[PDB]
Ligand binder design. Sequence first.
Ligand SMILES: CCCCCCCC/C=C/CCCCCCCC(=O)O[C@H](COC(=O)CCCCCCCCCCCCCCC)COP(=O)(O)OC[C@@H](O)CO
Ligand SMILES: CCCCCCCC/C=C/CCCCCCCC(=O)O[C@H](COC(=O)CCCCCCCCCCCCCCC)COP(=O)(O)OC[C@@H](O)CO
Ligand SMILES: CCCCCCCC/C=C\CCCCCCCC(=O)O[C@H](COC(=O)CCCCCCCCCCCCCCC)COP(=O)(O)OC[C@@H](O)CO
Ligand SMILES: CCCCCCCCCCCC(=O)OC[C@H](COP(=O)([O-])O)OC(=O)CCCCCCCCCCC
Ligand SMILES: *[C@@H]1O[C@H](CO)[C@@H](O[C@@H]2O[C@H](CO)[C@@H](O)[C@H](O)[C@H]2NC(C)=O)[C@H](O)[C@H]1NC(C)=O
Ligand SMILES: CC(C)CCC[C@@H](C)[C@H]1CC[C@H]2[C@@H]3CC=C4C[C@@H](O)CC[C@]4(C)[C@H]3CC[C@]12C
Ligand SMILES: CCCCCCCCCCCCCCCC(=O)O
Ligand SMILES: CCCCCCCCCCCCCCCC(=O)O
Ligand SMILES: CCCCCCCCCCCCCCCC
Ligand SMILES: CCCCCCCCCCCCCCCC
Ligand SMILES: CCCCCCCCCCCCCCCC
Ligand SMILES: CCCCCCCCCCCCCCCC
Ligand SMILES: CCCCCCCCCCCCCCCC
Ligand SMILES: *[C@@H]1O[C@H](CO)[C@@H](O)[C@H](O)[C@H]1NC(C)=O
Ligand SMILES: CCCCCCCCCC
Ligand SMILES: CCCCCCCCCC
Ligand SMILES: CCCCCCCCCC
Ligand SMILES: CCCCCC
Ligand SMILES: CCCCCC
Ligand SMILES: CCCCCC
Ligand SMILES: CCCCCC
Ligand SMILES: CCCCCC
Lengths: 330, 185, 284, 67, 33
Amino acid sequence: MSFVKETVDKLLKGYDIRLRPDFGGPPVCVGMNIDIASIDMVSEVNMDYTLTMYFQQYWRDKRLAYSGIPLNLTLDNRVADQLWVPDTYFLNDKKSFVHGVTVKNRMIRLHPDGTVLYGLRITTTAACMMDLRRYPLDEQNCTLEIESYGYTTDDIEFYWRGGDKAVTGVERIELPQFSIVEHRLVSRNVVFATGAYPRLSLSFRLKRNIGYFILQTYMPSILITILSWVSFWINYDASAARVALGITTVLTMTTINTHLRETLPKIPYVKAIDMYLMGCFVFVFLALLEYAFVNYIFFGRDVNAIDRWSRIVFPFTFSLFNLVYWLYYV
Amino acid sequence: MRNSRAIGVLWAIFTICFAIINVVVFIQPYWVGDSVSTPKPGYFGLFHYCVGSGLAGRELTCRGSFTDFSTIPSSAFKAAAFFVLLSMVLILGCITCFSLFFFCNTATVYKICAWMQLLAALCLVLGCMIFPDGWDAETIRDMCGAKTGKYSLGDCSVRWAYILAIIGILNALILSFLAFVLGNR
Amino acid sequence: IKVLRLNSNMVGKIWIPDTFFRNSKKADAHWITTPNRMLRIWNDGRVLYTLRLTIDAECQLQLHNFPMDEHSCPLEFSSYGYPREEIVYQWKRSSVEVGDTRSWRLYQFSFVGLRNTTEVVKTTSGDYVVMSVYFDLSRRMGYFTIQTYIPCTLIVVLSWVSFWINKDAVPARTSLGITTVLTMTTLSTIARKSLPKVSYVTAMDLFVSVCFIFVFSALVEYGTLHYFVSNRKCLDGKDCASFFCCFEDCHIRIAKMDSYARIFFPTAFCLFNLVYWVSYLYLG
Amino acid sequence: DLSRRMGYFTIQTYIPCTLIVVLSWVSFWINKDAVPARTSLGITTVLTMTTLSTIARKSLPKVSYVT
Amino acid sequence: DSRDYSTELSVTVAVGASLLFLNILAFAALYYK
Ligand SMILES: CCCCCCCC/C=C/CCCCCCCC(=O)O[C@H](COC(=O)CCCCCCCCCCCCCCC)COP(=O)(O)OC[C@@H](O)CO
Ligand SMILES: CCCCCCCC/C=C/CCCCCCCC(=O)O[C@H](COC(=O)CCCCCCCCCCCCCCC)COP(=O)(O)OC[C@@H](O)CO
Ligand SMILES: CCCCCCCC/C=C\CCCCCCCC(=O)O[C@H](COC(=O)CCCCCCCCCCCCCCC)COP(=O)(O)OC[C@@H](O)CO
Ligand SMILES: CCCCCCCCCCCC(=O)OC[C@H](COP(=O)([O-])O)OC(=O)CCCCCCCCCCC
Ligand SMILES: *[C@@H]1O[C@H](CO)[C@@H](O[C@@H]2O[C@H](CO)[C@@H](O)[C@H](O)[C@H]2NC(C)=O)[C@H](O)[C@H]1NC(C)=O
Ligand SMILES: CC(C)CCC[C@@H](C)[C@H]1CC[C@H]2[C@@H]3CC=C4C[C@@H](O)CC[C@]4(C)[C@H]3CC[C@]12C
Ligand SMILES: CCCCCCCCCCCCCCCC(=O)O
Ligand SMILES: CCCCCCCCCCCCCCCC(=O)O
Ligand SMILES: CCCCCCCCCCCCCCCC
Ligand SMILES: CCCCCCCCCCCCCCCC
Ligand SMILES: CCCCCCCCCCCCCCCC
Ligand SMILES: CCCCCCCCCCCCCCCC
Ligand SMILES: CCCCCCCCCCCCCCCC
Ligand SMILES: *[C@@H]1O[C@H](CO)[C@@H](O)[C@H](O)[C@H]1NC(C)=O
Ligand SMILES: CCCCCCCCCC
Ligand SMILES: CCCCCCCCCC
Ligand SMILES: CCCCCCCCCC
Ligand SMILES: CCCCCC
Ligand SMILES: CCCCCC
Ligand SMILES: CCCCCC
Ligand SMILES: CCCCCC
Ligand SMILES: CCCCCC
């Protein structure tokens, strides 16, 4: 017992937090690992995503070397106050914190060879832009960029420990609207005139799931558009019936539009769903305008020619519009 | 007329039983079960599947639903379940069309369910064909053995739902032909 | 003094375990008017350490069967840094202490049962012992019965009302069908506001979609009836085709489409409801 | 210096409003004897315009002056 | 049970065979004139 105590006591003294390991020597190589516990929420409105993870660094320090103690030492987390750590930080962060209950969720581990493993439980609201031009038929390219604030590559280097096995726990994630397709690791150096700074990047590709929209946005619009075409088979003298059907279909599309935007993200950005709804709106508008023409020409001024041609053109043109839309956006 | 009435009623009973069987096999996940050579315990159906957690009891953790295509771990399963659901819709359409016996002549309604039962059998047959093709998925490969693949049973067993699907196919074909002959009589 | 109760300040001097709750996105302890932490020592060599916590623990809710969904929400904890060889946890045994359920803040859910479990995880930095408590919760359907199911069913019935209206009342039946469609859309808009923005549809979404298809089918049925009534005008037995497609002549018997609809639509809806409720309540 | 993008608001308000107004005009070509048709068209057009008017001030503060 | 799926498979085959026997019995009864 006492031998361990005096070992750690001599380890702590003579150690300067203000100086990095091998200050006059080569840069210290820091391996980095991540274990994602839960991506809590991904926001299109704010263009960000909250991510809870076990971040781990790993670096060799000669000053913290001890011998005669084959057992690994998991010191108290408060000991991390007295030990030097990298200046790692996330560039695309908007807000982040470390969980404090019951004790500060942090860990420092020493090894007999003098290596340090420094782990933290970080909940960070990272930022990623989202090309919503094809929403909801869109795939996002969200990233976590990890870099050193002050040191250049000459003073500190970052690499992924374990290679492609650096990041785990992605399979444990089940987002409520997105489906993770792939994750990629990139280790590089950003070069400026003064010097090159190390950087790591953890990039997830997220595919959006559309079955919600397919069943409550697209299918209602298609069926209201077809119910609008039902007008062309109603007898031309039935002005009340045909006008009521057309105007109520227009009102129903307006209702779908107005109440949809209440639920989708609050962004004045033009999206694919907006084009689809606008096209269906134009189609129902033209369906009512068709009866305007019909009532003026024949009643106002052996099915008539306008209904005869409408019955084929409107379904055919709507099918062509659907084909172009789905081919362009998919 | 007595004999025709009796056989018609019995045919209705059998069609209802076939519809119940179709619902049971569609919802239930016991199409493929684990085996002695299987690496882990579990069982997968058309869309739903239970996987061994990785401990003594395994908790029978399950995930997968036809309501969520994103959770079905293959494109062959999404087609097989779709065909089985189409069969469900057709047989239920016939069960509704029993109501048309009130007004329409008997022969026409009998023939209409004859074609609906034939189409239900065809869709169920197609679902049974494409269902094995999805056994090559990563989840199924991890479950029913590495050797398991497209139509390759491998280190894994087969459970009652898969054979009951073929039983329902046979029942559907028999009922379709029975209704066809009833219509002309 | 056999029991030395301790102040809440110097507890930091005494080593305490690194117990942290794994499935917690945010937790805290209230600090006023004093810290809400206590410690006690017993000269036999025992330490007791009690806190006050309000954990917003996560719970992955599988809302596929919403509002018929039952959940088993977990609450897990383990040492943050010490593997199994360094710390091992355990229960007091003899169940877990819970107060009266009637005073709990469970409105949308009803408490059912409590369970405890322990296991060892295989994380990269050693193998930690994790202990979990599962709370079983069952949702109450009463709000969704009056908000969604009964209004949707009654709107479908009002769509069926069109079959008993005279066929020549074109504006009446057209307005009835299209306004039923509009009302169903209005209900469908609010059906999802309680739920999160989940991308797969639920049981209630499927119910609403089927009701929308039923009212759409009723309006299409009237349109079909209106167009045709006014605007238009070998081996066994015999042939193999005779055994199959009657297709005789072909419709002559289409003016009586309303009589067919009057039975078909209620019967189809009843069958859909039977299968849906049996599947989601008992057989699922 | 920031310049607003107007295409979103274009498709949201300017085109639907213009088309509801063109549909109102559609009444002028319907036969005058069709009292229920023209009355329903006019009043439901007013209702649709009322429904559209509410979504105007959905991404804006409650400035007393009008935009 | 572990991997024991003999009884369930056997009883499923038995009830399916019984149902098919009833179906083909009715069909054969109708086929005869
Ligand atoms: C597993 C247990 C299941 C128990 C269910 C038992 C139900 C069994 C019913 C079989 C019906 C088919 C039998 C064959 C019918 C043969 C025909 C028959 O019997 O006579 C006709 C119908 O009679 C009739 O009332 C029969 C009318 C059809 C009754 C069936 C309606 C569908 C009800 C929804 C089904 C739900 C099932 C699932 C529930 C769990 C009436 O002659 P009618 O000259 O006037 O016609 C006009 C025409 O002559 C030309 O104008
Ligand atoms: C077919 C041909 C159609 C052509 C179409 C022609 C259309 C003609 C355009 C008009 C634009 C109207 C713009 C002005 C409307 C807004 C009126 C307004 O500004 O509010 C108060 C008006 O005065 C007042 O208090 C009290 C006086 C109230 C006068 C409000 C006028 C309302 C608009 C009347 C339109 C009716 C049209 C009828 C057609 C049937 C002033 O705020 P107050 O100082 O209190 O506090 C400060 C607060 O205003 C800070 O924002
Ligand atoms: C009497 C008349 C009655 C009406 C007729 C019956 C109407 C029936 C209703 C609904 C079913 C319609 C079929 C829908 C087929 C679409 C099925 C599908 O899932 O396709 C996805 C997109 O495809 C892709 O990747 C790329 C292809 C995209 C093309 C999507 C097609 C949508 C068409 C819009 C539907 C209009 C239907 C209206 C018919 C009248 C792929 O899945 P994914 O892995 O992303 O998992 C996400 C998911 O699981 C989250 O819930
Ligand atoms: C339009 C008239 C015919 C169709 C009516 C269908 C039922 C009414 C709509 C369904 C929803 C409703 O009103 O009640 C739902 C509740 C569910 O609550 P709980 O009992 O599960 O707690 O109650 C239920 O459990 C619903 C039971 C419904 C059974 C299915 C209908 C059976 C009809 C005969 C079939 C042969
Ligand atoms: C103390 O920790 C070190 C490094 O974390 C362990 O060293 C590894 O131990 C495992 C299993 O014991 C071996 O498979 C590896 O080859 C060892 N080296 C490395 C670099 O991983 C060491 O075993 C731990 N001490 C124990 C378990 O008593
Ligand atoms: C009335 C006739 C014509 C058609 C009726 C078809 C009904 C019974 C069908 C249509 C859609 C079906 C549902 C589609 C998806 C699922 C999810 C699955 O995990 C359980 C079964 C369940 C919940 C199905 C139950 C049966 C269902 C409701
Ligand atoms: C942008 C669209 C404007 C629509 C304006 C409403 C016109 C609908 C009624 C047109 C009636 C037909 C008039 C022309 C008849 C003819 O050419 O002989
Ligand atoms: C929306 C595009 C589809 C509608 C196409 C309309 C084609 C109309 C062709 C007939 C034009 C002549 C109508 C007047 C006939 C008359 O002299 O009475
Ligand atoms: C894209 C996710 C899958 C959603 C599956 C929806 C199935 C809807 C079934 C509709 C059945 C309509 C029957 C209408 C006639 C009664
Ligand atoms: C409080 C428990 C949940 C709600 C129970 C049912 C509420 C009342 C239902 C009334 C249904 C009226 C149907 C009328 C049909 C003509
Ligand atoms: C429930 C009203 C019965 C009215 C009977 C009058 C003759 C019409 C026969 C068809 C009745 C079918 C009712 C189907 C269940 C609502
Ligand atoms: C960044 C693009 C903004 C959208 C620009 C307008 C797109 C085209 C609008 C067409 C609206 C339909 C007019 C139909 C008139 C009959
Ligand atoms: C610089 C971009 C300008 C975009 C123009 C938006 C036009 C919105 C539609 C208004 C069209 C009114 C025409 C009325 C003709 C009767
Ligand atoms: C919970 O854990 C205790 C102690 O391990 C055990 O006695 C008990 O059976 C477990 N289950 C329940 C329901 O309390
Ligand atoms: C702004 C989206 C316009 C989509 C096309 C409108 C329908 C044209 C049908 C000929
Ligand atoms: C979103 C792009 C839609 C293009 C519409 C082109 C008109 C097709 C119908 C004539
Ligand atoms: C959805 C279009 C409504 C069609 C009415 C019936 C058309 C009959 C054409 C033979
Ligand atoms: C949109 C209807 C146009 C008809 C031209 C005669
Ligand atoms: C005259 C009937 C045309 C139908 C086009 C779908
Ligand atoms: C998927 C779009 C279908 C449109 C049919 C007119
Ligand atoms: C009816 C044609 C639909 C095309 C969808 C890509
Ligand atoms: C709620 C259904 C009422 C039916 C009356 C015949």
